[PDB]
Structure 1
Amino acid sequence: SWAQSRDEQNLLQQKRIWESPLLLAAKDNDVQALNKLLKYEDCKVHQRGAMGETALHIAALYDNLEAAMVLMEAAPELVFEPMTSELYEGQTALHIAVVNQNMNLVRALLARRASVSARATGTAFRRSPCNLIYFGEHPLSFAACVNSEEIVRLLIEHGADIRAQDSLGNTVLHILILQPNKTFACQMYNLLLSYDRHGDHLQPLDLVPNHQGLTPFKLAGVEGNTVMFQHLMQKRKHTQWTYGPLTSTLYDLTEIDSSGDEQSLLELIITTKKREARQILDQTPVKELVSLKWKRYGRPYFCMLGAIYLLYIICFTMCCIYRPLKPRTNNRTSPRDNTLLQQKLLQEAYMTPKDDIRLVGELVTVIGAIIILLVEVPDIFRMGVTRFFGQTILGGPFHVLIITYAFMVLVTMVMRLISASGEVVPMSFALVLGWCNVMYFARGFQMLGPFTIMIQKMIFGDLMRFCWLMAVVILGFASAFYIIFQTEDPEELGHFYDYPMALFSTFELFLTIIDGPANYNVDLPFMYSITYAAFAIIATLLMLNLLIAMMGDTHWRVAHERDELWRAQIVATTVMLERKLPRCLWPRSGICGREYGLGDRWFLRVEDRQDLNRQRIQR
């Protein structure tokens, strides 16, 4: 019961207005009530509301100009008074007039020496999905979000700075990105920079980080505000000559590479959770960058790397299919021929030249198993645990399979030193998950592998919520069959000789694999025939064929949102490969600078065609 108390308090605000004679006269513009009640009687006008009101706030809140002017005389000091506590802390009456976008009360309040640095630190202003808005803390920031120019111009001209910060360290620039109205707030961003008159030694207001260290450029990259990203790009590109329909631009390439430790754009984009931020990669100075980092310098190191893992798994299976085996030892088949097995796993036999070769490749797998683990030690000692799941889902959700591959290789190394019995079960998981993990490289070789996105997209979700409705209809019917052949001799119809196999036996019928039980020579009981017919027309005609059409629908609701995933995942393949690989190979891309006397920043260039009918309509 957290949000209920907010509503509980909010009705309690009204009742105080309903019972105080001043405040209800403050809610309306009952001038002669306020004429008579104020000057005559001897009452204290410092009556706080339910959430800490004054009389001047209510007149401000219910847009009541002329009542506030009469309040100016009797209240020389209520201008300086803030609101009291726990939701609206410090919200003075200067703020509330700004939210109603004008009253010319700012005229009155700044005539009444109102402070412009009182900070609204209340609960209902912090950035949260509980509140429906976010307006910062300072009264300048209130005027900025409602897009009201002449109030903003007024506030600079009375001594308001433009460099205040919130609890999160956000400037007034950062607030404009988080507004939901995009194009109607882009104009404000140019206006406030015009009042950056003082050339400061520290930074020129555009490089100010927050408490998690973000320039307003990068924060717009995080939130996917494309139109704002497009407009701030304009001040960093630098145009060279133009030649008819050609144009030679020169993008800046400073805060968008992985040069610094800040990582500054691209690790910030792929580690988002929001969907819309992946749209940024289609913009012009970025899409050109990663296409150069992949067509050159990314693809051959990747495919040469994926060839190495392919030679690893082959070396594993060769030292898998040759195992030290012997014939069965002295224990003959003691159950009555329900016990057929014949080999049992040699103890300490190595004395062949053949086993020397097998010893070599077996050590190759073990040394490789250690290498996988030591890479992943600094990974999950820093990036939490569920924080790693936030890294996981997008483009690298295998990343534990290669971990659980390594545990199974270690256990079978531990197993043969102990020389214990059940050594076939760790070899099993270490063999499927080995070959399944090469599907990680389906991003490569061409765009002939985005299946590994879609098969991921469908093994979760679509199969998974279909699996339970399998798992109950099988659970009755299999249990129904174990009763119905309880009487019978299992020498015929060995499908159902006991309950635990009868589930798995029924499971083969649900997917149309086993042939379906029949004997034709012994009359099987008369309740089977009705029941098993009822099984088929649910399972292999209604239930399964539902899954194809349900699969058939979901294939083309993700037509568009499949292809951009693939080009997103290459970026995730790129930067991870850049981060773990040292230099003196595939250098920091783009053209180096300051040899041309241009700056320490590095650059790259793009040509294009204007399609000059746009020039020709430009009348």
Structure 2
Amino acid sequence: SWAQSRDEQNLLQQKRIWESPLLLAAKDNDVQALNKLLKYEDCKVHQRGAMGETALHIAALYDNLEAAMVLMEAAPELVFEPMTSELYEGQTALHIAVVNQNMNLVRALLARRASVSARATGTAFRRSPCNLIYFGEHPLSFAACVNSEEIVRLLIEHGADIRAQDSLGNTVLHILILQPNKTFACQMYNLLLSYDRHGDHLQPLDLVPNHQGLTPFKLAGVEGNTVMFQHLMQKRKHTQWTYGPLTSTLYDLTEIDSSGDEQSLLELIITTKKREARQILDQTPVKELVSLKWKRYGRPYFCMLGAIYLLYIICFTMCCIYRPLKPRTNNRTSPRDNTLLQQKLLQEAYMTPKDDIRLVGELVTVIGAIIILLVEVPDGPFHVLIITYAFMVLVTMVMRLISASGEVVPMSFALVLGWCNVMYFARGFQMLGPFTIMIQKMIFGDLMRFCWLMAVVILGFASAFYIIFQTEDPEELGHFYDYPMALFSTFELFLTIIDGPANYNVDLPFMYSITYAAFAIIATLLMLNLLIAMMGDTHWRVAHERDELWRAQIVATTVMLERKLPRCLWPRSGICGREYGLGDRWFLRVED
């Protein structure tokens, strides 16, 4: 795709260099070739390359100081020229010699007054999975990322703005957090903060947001950058006293905790795809904050909601047990017809006092289903299940009003969805909590991958079992009497939850005993135990990280409860200042 086009422009770049004697002598720094071409005609001194590059760009790429100096003496207006293509738009040779860390050639270009504010907006510089570097857009950003302490100072002396932002809004401090070598990126962060002696007014530059709204501290939390997180936390950390081995430590807790309705650090870490962002939860001020919110306010409000939900589902269950049924009016159509009862009409469903007790429970059920929709729809997996529950309750309400047959099908969905939603409240308990993570990763992991191989063995053998018994009498062996039942029976024989079809009083077809023996080996022995071996591996992986997974469950529940409860009902965690003379900020004390 774009990779194929980037491959072709890279080969087109090397061709145009070989086609041009100037670009070739710029690549391989033959001084005698460059001297002859310039003492001749212009020879395309402003030659536009394949990448939009010039000759002075080329000597910058290939680390050719002696070539680049002769090209600057030849034409000094090339120093200001930007590279002109979609890949490398607005890139100067000052950008290139910075990235190549060519110390003598950056000093030479700054002597010829190369711009330090030149923005490199080409798509090879944008933050994308296709690019292997994200350095920003400015030369100061590029030198900060290749860890060149000598070049960042020279750019600042020549007037590079430390406050310059790229198209994503990131300053140079944001970009350093996005870098793979974190320990070098810490030291460059400390260097660039030291040059914010002026301009700390109107923003201190460690507090600038990007276009997502993130400061460098919140970006370190969101990106899973734990090394930069601990280093940024030192600024927000205050030592209160030291009593030998003890230390009382006061944490700032402003951007960490939900200071406003805008998403804080706890919500952004839960609502992100990055697995390594969850490593911020066992960092020190974040870990005791989550535990404090849960024990004081999270777990009491959650256990109340689980108790109310459990009483409500018991109420819904009893209305389904006592659903209005009467003896059937019509006669039995076939001997296969097994139905004895049918559901009452609306006019006769409510005529006794026991029907009035059920009516109260049915209204409590319907009112609860509306409140589930009013909480959840005006906006997870249990998110979908409780909406699917409340939808099924309203469907059976509509069928009750218009007297529609088949209320058993919305109720049966609603019974199993209503009671399996109680497993949501297992996360109030630490031992019970990651059990449902095991169930999710066994369903949407092991089952969804291996059901396709199971379904095709079931389809093969049920089709074989169907045609083997297609000529036989079903009254003796009716497991495969029609093709939907044959398919359901083979699924049950797969799971060994029904017995193998046997009638010793008749002769079964010869082909059955061979096919069922082949089925018993591949399906019940091999593939069934293969799946169980997978799910035991899922169990082992989730139980290994179960404390970390439970803590991530607690934050998501705390973020959700704080979002839905009133602010009077959820007090802010920690200790506010300003009655102790600390400002209006809410602090958290940790004694270690």
SS at match of 2:306: helix
Secondary structure of the residue aligned to 1:3 is helix
Using the TM superposition, give the Cα deviation of residue 208 of structure 1 relative to its aligned residue in structure 2, in angstroms. 0.6
Equivalent residue of 2:250, what SS? strand
**1:232 deviation in Å?**
0.9
Shift of residue 337, structure 1, vs aligned partner: 6.5
The answer on whether the counterparts of 2:90 and 2:120 sit within 8 Å (CA) in structure 1 is yes
Distance 1:206 1:346, change over 3 A: closer
In 1, distance between residues paired with 2:575 and 2:7?
Answer: 60
Give the stretch that moved more between structures: 396-405 or 217-226: 396-405
Structure 2 vs 1, CA of residues 465 and 44 (structure 1 numbering), >3 Å: closer, same or farther?
Answer: closer
Cα shift at 1:544: 1.8
- Helix, strand or coil for the counterpart of 2:414? helix
Classify 1:345/1:521 alpha carbon distance in 2 versus 1 (closer, same or farther; 3 Å).
farther
Match of 1:115 in 2: 115
| 1:320 CA drift (Å) | 1.4
1:567-603 per-residue CA deviation (whole Å, 9 max, x = no partner) reads 1101111121111111333411111211122211121
Per the TM alignment, residue 533 of structure 1 is displaced from its structure 2 partner at its CA by 2.1
Aligned partners of 2:240 and 2:248 also within 8 Å: yes
Structure 1 Cα separation of the partners of residues 188 and 337 of structure 2 = 87
Deviation of the 1:437 alpha carbon: 1.0
Distance 1:2 1:605, change over 3 A: same
Secondary structure in 2 aligned to 1:555?
A: helix
8 A Cα contact 1:147 1:184, kept in partner: yes
- The 5 A counterparts of 1:107-506 are 107-333=107-333, 348-379=348-379, 396-506=380-490
- Provide the residue aligned with 2:14 in structure 1: 14
SS state at 2:238 partner: coil
Distance 1:338 1:494, change over 3 A: farther
Indicate how the Cα distance of structure 1 residues 27 and 336 shifts in structure 2: closer, same or farther if over 3 A, else same: closer
Shift in Å, 1:44: 4.1
1:321-365, CA deviations, whole angstroms, 9 ceiling, x for partnerless residues?
Answer: 112222222535465867766776675342222222222111111
Using the alignment, how far apart are the partners of 1:436 and 1:182 within structure 2? 44
2:44 maps to what in 1? 44
Q: What secondary structure, in the 3-state scheme, does the structure 1 residue paired with 2:7 have? A: helix
Tell me, yes or no, if the aligned pair for 2:217 and 2:232 is still in contact at 8 Å. yes
Inter-CA distance 332–95: structure 2 relative to 1 (3 Å threshold): closer
Within 2, Cα distance between the matches of 1:43 and 1:181? Answer: 44
Query: How far apart are the structure 1 equivalents of 2:107 and 2:521?
Result: 80
Q: CA deviation at 1:519?
A: 2.2
Q: Whole-Å Cα distance in 2 between the matches of residues 13 and 261 of structure 1?
A: 51
C-alpha distance 323-70 of structure 1, shift in aligned 2 (>3 A): closer
> Counterparts of 1:346 and 1:68 in 2: how far apart (Å)?
92
Q: Distance in 2 between matches of 1:472 and 1:423?
A: 33
Per-residue CA deviation, residues 227-262 of structure 1 (Å, 9 max, x unaligned), is 111111111111122121111211111111112122
CA distance in 2, matches of 1:71, 1:506: 80
Equivalent in the alignment of 1:54 = 54
Inter-CA distance 24–582: structure 2 relative to 1 (3 Å threshold)? same
Inter-partner Cα distance in structure 1 for 2:338 and 2:320 = 28
Deviation, structure 1 residue 551: 2.9
Contact 1:325/1:346 (8 A) holds in 2: no
Does the Cα contact within 8 Å between 1:328 and 1:344 map onto a contact in 2?
no
Which shows bigger deviation, 149-158 or 37-46? 37-46
Conserved 8 A contact 1:453-1:566? no
- Structure-2 change in CA distance of 1:234 and 1:346 (3 Å): closer
Deviation, 1:52, is: 1.7
CA contact (8 A) 2:346 2:401 kept: no
Matched-pair contact (CA < 8 Å) for 2:345–2:403: no
Report the CA distance shift for 1:352/1:75 in structure 2 as closer, same or farther (over 3 A).
Answer: same
Q: Could you tell me which residue of structure 2 aligns to residue 71 of structure 1?
A: 71
Equivalent pairs, count: 591
Aligned-CA RMSD value:
1.9
CA shift at 1:174, angstroms?
Answer: 0.7
Local SS of the residue matching 1:191 = helix
Do 2:430 and 2:550's aligned partners in 1 also have CA atoms closer than 8 Å? no
Contact 1:326 1:345 in 2 (8 A): no
TM-score (norm 1): 0.91
Q: Do the aligned partners of residues 22 and 331 (structure 1) sit closer, same or farther apart at CA in structure 2, a change above 3 Å counting?
A: same
Change (3 A) 1:499 1:103: same
- Inter-CA distance 318–122: structure 2 relative to 1 (3 Å threshold): same
Q: Distance in 2 between matches of 1:586 and 1:344?
A: 47
Structure 1 residues 308, 224: CA separation in 2 closer, same or farther (over 3 Å shift)?
Answer: same
Higher mean C-alpha displacement, 104-113 vs 334-343: 334-343
Report the structure, 1 or 2, having the larger helix content. Answer: 2
Deviations 1:7-26 (A, max 9, x none): 11211111222121222222
**Contact 2:437–2:542 under 8 Å retained in 1:** no
The answer on whether the counterparts of 2:91 and 2:118 sit within 8 Å (CA) in structure 1 is: yes
* Mapped partners of 2:482, 2:43: distance in 1: 91
Most deviating of 209-218 and 70-79: 70-79
Q: Give the superposition deviation at 1:298.
A: 1.7
In the TM superposition, what whole-angstrom CA distance separates every residue of 1:437-483 from its partner, at most 9, and x where no partner exists?
11110112452342111111111211222212221112121211222
Q: 1:568 aligns with which of 546, 552, 564?
A: 552
Q: Relative to 1, partners in 2 of residues 1:153 and 1:355: Cα closer, same or farther, differing over 3 Å?
A: same
**What SS is found at the alignment partner of 1:241?**
strand
Residue deviations 1:160-189 (CA, integer Å, cap 9, x gap)? 221111111111111100110110121111
* TM-fit CA distance, 1:537: 2.1
Aligned to 1:524: 508
Equivalent pair of 2:438/2:538 in contact (CA under 8 Å):
no
Q: Deviations over 1:350-392 (max 9, x none)?
A: 222222222211111111111111112321xxxxxxxxxxxxx
Structure 2 contact 29–64 (Cα < 8 Å) conserved: yes
Q: 1:445 to 1:111 in 2, by over 3 A?
A: closer
Normalised TM-score (structure 2): 0.95
- Residue 158 (structure 1) shift: 1.3
- The more displaced of 344-353 and 303-312 is 344-353
Q: Is the 8 A contact 1:137 1:166 kept in 2?
A: yes
Separation in 2, partners of 1:77, 1:45: 11
* Distance in 2 between residues matched to 1:568 and 1:514, nearest whole Å: 40
Contiguous gaps of at least 5 residues in structure 2: none
Residue matched to 2:95: 95
* 600 and 549 in structure 1: CA distance in 2 versus 1, 3 angstrom threshold: same
Q: In the alignment, is the contact (CA less than 8 A) between 1:443 and 1:570 conserved in 2?
A: yes
Once the two structures are superposed, residues 37-60 of structure 1 have per-residue CA deviations (whole angstroms, 9 ceiling, x without a partner) of 212445441111112222211112
**CA offsets, 1:177-221, max 9 Å, x none?**
011011012111111111112144311111111111111110111
Specify whether residues 39 and 51 from structure 1 end up closer, same or farther in structure 2 by C-alpha distance, changes over 3 A only: same
- Distance in 2 (CA, whole Å) between partners of 1:83 and 1:509 is 69
Structure 1 residues 147, 418: closer, same or farther in 2, change over 3 A? same
Displacement of 1:497 in angstroms is 2.5
Paired residues of 2:236 and 2:252 also in contact (CA < 8 A): yes
The 8 Å contact of residues 347 and 419 in structure 1, kept in 2 or not, is answered as no
| Residues 5 and 489 of structure 1, relative CA distance in 2, 3 Å threshold | same
> Secondary structure of 2:50's match?
coil
Deviations along 1:550-578, one digit per CA (max 9) or x if unpaired, are: 33334323443333111110111112111
CA shift for structure 1 position 400:
1.1
Asked if structure 2 preserves the Cα contact closer than 8 Å seen for 1:174 and 1:219, the reply is: yes
Residue 590 of structure 1 contacts residue 602 of structure 1 at CA under 8 Å; is this kept in 2?
yes
Instruction: Show CA shifts across 1:295-331 (max 9, x none).
Output: 1222111111110011101111221111222222253
